[PDB]
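Audit log entry. Action: structure prediction of a protein-small molecule complex. Ligand: zinc ion. The ligand was supplied as SMILES and no pocket hint was given, so placement is left entirely to the predictor. Protonation state taken as written. Sequence taken verbatim from the request; no trimming, no tag removal. Recorded inputs:
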Amino acid sequence: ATKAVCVLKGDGPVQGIINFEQKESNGPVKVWGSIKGLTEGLHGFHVHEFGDNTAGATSAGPHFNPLSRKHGGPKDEERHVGDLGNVTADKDGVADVSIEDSVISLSGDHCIIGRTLVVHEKADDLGKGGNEESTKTGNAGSRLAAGVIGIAQ
Amino acid sequence: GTLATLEFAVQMTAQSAVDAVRKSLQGVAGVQDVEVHLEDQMVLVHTTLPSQEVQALLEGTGRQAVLKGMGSGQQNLGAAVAILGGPGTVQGVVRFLQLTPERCLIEGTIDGLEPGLHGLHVHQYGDLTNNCNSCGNHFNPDGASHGGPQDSDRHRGDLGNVRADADGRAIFRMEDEQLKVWDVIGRSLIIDEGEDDLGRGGHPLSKITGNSGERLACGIIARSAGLFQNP
Ligand SMILES: [Zn+2]
Ligand SMILES: [Zn+2]
């Protein structure tokens, strides 16, 4: 698929819509959109291995990771494929997301379609946290909102 | 139907918990094998029942039970789930399991429906920005005319009808030989307001949508774990 979209929802006030576009085969993926109702600051932003959300993050699996790496930031070479770092919310709680990424794709073995996108509570420490949980989830805390990434027209 | 292996994660510390769990499943209609693992906190269940029912049977005996995996014995060809929902009272969970390269088990439980036949369809896009209205038309890669599950000339997304009982619950389990799990990952599953006439209504929308009225609920067909893939 050439485009994709995700509608992030949660229990709290956090909600958002995220678009994906990939015009080149295995090319960069434009990730743009907006999330509102966040606290001001950096919020972890990750793609999970599965899109099953029948039991929350349990059924969602760990961070999408077909190359069995440890957690890093988007610009790190040692990263999970689903590691898209932090989005930044403004004083009004609005994070305007604008990202380019070539490790994720909308086709092939890094295809993120069918998988859960999550916006997290705290800042993702980008694998540099000095303890085991930093190499797994990046210590971003609990799930504020999520949705399945689907195919768009 | 075909046998399906369900991998449940069930909490059970004592040996008395293992005995309660095994008793609730063993000797029940449509449950071949049970295979409890105390060390791994796991219960494999070979069955022809819906997963929603086998989950209720486990949960009915005290301890909680989450479904973590789905296959058909020993290579996982593809598993998926669609959580139905939106603005109305309709909500449910439908699971897809690719049994063989040419056969797919679709199985689910849906509540909040008016008693009677409701059409069920895989639509082409998984775009929920305008809820079900943004999901596009019935998934039709072959450029076919609309039909029912029995018609070989049908849209690949055509799953016919689903009967809601007097309590508004609609349980079903079916195998489809044209729909493939990884052909529909990221697309949407939609349940409709009324009956799918299966192309046979003589109405302008009969050969397009089956004239089943408004879309009530819909979800994106998401990737889920096969057996032992999510620990
Ligand atoms: Zn990660
Ligand atoms: Zn159709």
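Audit: result stored. The radius of gyration of chain A is 14 Å. The helical segments of chain A are 57-60.
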